[PDB]
From a paper:
Mitochondrial proteins CHCHD10 and CHCHD2 are mutated in rare cases of heritable FTD, ALS and PD and aggregate in tissues affected by these diseases. Here, we demonstrate that the low complexity N-terminal domains of both D10 and D2, as well as the full-length proteins, can form amyloid fibrils in vitro and in vivo. Structures of D10 and D2 fibrils assembled in vitro from the low complexity N-terminal domains of each protein show that their core comprises the most highly conserved region between the two proteins. For D10 and D2, the central conserved VAV motif forms a beta-strand that is associated with the protofilament interface in all the structures we have observed, suggesting that it may be a critical element in fibril formation and may be expected to appear in ex vivo structures as well.
D2 also features disease-linked mutations in the region constituting the core of D2-NT fibrils. Notably, the most commonly reported pathogenic D2 mutation p.T61I33 occurs at a position facing the interior of the D2 PF fold, suggesting that this mutation, too, could promote alternative fibril structures. To assess this, we solved the structure of T61I D2-NT fibrils to 3.09 Å resolution. These fibrils featured a novel PF fold, consisting of residues G54–G87, that differs from the WT D2-NT fold, all three WT D10-NT folds, and the S59L D10-NT fold. In addition, the T61I PF fold appears to contain several LARKS (low complexity aromatic-linked kinked segments), likely stemming from three glycine-aromatic dipeptides (G59–H60, G63–H64, and G69–F70). Unlike the case of S59L, the T61I mutation does not flip the larger isoleucine sidechain to the PF fold exterior. However, the two valines in the VAV motif, which are found at the PF interface in all other protofilament structures we have observed, are flipped towards the PF interior in the T61I fold. In contrast, the aggregation rates of the T61I D2 mutant did not result in substantial alteration of the aggregation kinetics of D2-NT or appreciable signal loss in NMR spectra. However, the T61I mutation in D2, which also incorporates a large hydrophobic residue, did not result in substantial changes to the aggregation kinetics of the protein or in appreciable signal loss in NMR spectra, indicating that other factors beyond hydrophobicity influence aggregation kinetics.
Residue numbers in the entry:
A (entry chain H), B (entry chain G), C (entry chain F), D (entry chain L), E (entry chain K), F (entry chain J), ...: 54 to 87
The structure:
């Protein structure tokens, strides 16, 4: 029984082009993870 | 019995082009994950 | 018995072009996940 | 017996073009997921 | 016996073009999922 | 015996063009899913 | 039973080109991880 | 039962080109990890 | 049961070219790791 | 002005079960394609 | 003006089960493609 | 103007199970491709 | 103007299970590719 | 103008299980590639 | 204008399990590549 | 204009398990590469 | 214009386990490379 | 214009475990490289 607060599971990834945010956390301001 | 607060499961991914946010968390402001 | 608060399961993904938000969380303001 | 608060299951995905929000959560304001 | 609060099951997806919201949650205001 | 609060099951999907909301939840205001 | 506050699991990654943020944490402002 | 505050697990990585932030922490401002 | 405050685990890495920040911590301002 | 000697264009495909020949060429004997 | 001697274009494919030949060339005997 | 003697273009592929020949060339005997 | 004697282009591939020949050339006997 | 005698282009590959031949050349007998 | 007698181009590969031949040349008998 | 008699180009490779032949040449008998 | 009689180009390789032949030449019998 | 009779180019290699032949030449019998 595993837990993931933020999970992005992509086994096969092939990106020809990606301008800007890509598969990440663009967090701004606040985030209460405690 | 696993739990995922934010899950994006994409086994086969092939992106020709993606300008801007792509498969991520563009979180702004607040998020209570505790 | 697994649980997913936010689940986007896409086995085969092929995106020719995607300008803007794509398969993500554009969360703004608040979100009570506790 | 699995549970999914937000589920978008799309086995075969092929997007020629998608400008704007696409297969995601454009959540603004509030969301009580606790 | 599985449960899905929000389910969009589309096995074969082929989108030539989709401007705007597409196969997602454009949630604004509030949502009591607890 | 499965249950789906919001179910949109479309096996074969082929969208030539779709401007605006498409196969999603344009929820505004409130929704009591608890 | 493992836990991941921020998890991005991508087994096979092949990026032809990616200008800007890519598979990371662009955190600005604050983040309460304690 | 392992825990990862920030985890980016990518077994096979092959980047043809990546200008800018790539698979890292572009943290600015503050971050409470204690 | 191991813990990693900042973990970037990439078994196989092959970077053809990467101009700028790459697989690191571009921390500016503050970070409370105590 | 494109030409296709054998064309089977099916944008959205969802096959629950298919025992035997399925969406292919079961060519036996001869075929003069020159 | 492209040409395809044998073309099977299926953008979105989702096969639950397929016993036997599936989306291929079961060529036996001869085929003059010169 | 491209040409493909044998083309099977399937952007999004998701195969739950496939016993036997699947998306290939089961060529036996002869084939004149010169 | 590219040419492919045997082309199987599948951008997004996700195979749950495949016993036997899968996305290949099971060539037996002869094949004149000169 | 490139040429490929045997081409199997699969950008995003994710194989859960594959017993037997998989994405290869099971050539037996003869093959005239000169 | 490049040429490939045997080409298997798979950008993103993620194999959970593969018993037997996998992405190779199981050539037996003869092959005239001169 | 490069040439490859046997080419298997896989940028991102992640193999959980592979018993037997894997991404190689199991050549037996003869092969005329001169 | 380079030539490769036997080429296996895999930029990012991550093998969890591989019992038996793996990314090599299991040549037995004969091979005419002159 | 370089030539490689046997080339296995793997930039990033990370092998957790590999019992048996691994990234080599298990040549038995004969090989005419002159």
């Amino acid at each position: 029984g595993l837990m993931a607060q933020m999970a992005i599971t992509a086994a096969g990834v092939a990106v020809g082009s990606a301008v800007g945010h890509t598969l990440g956390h663009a967090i701004t301001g606040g985030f209460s993870g405690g």
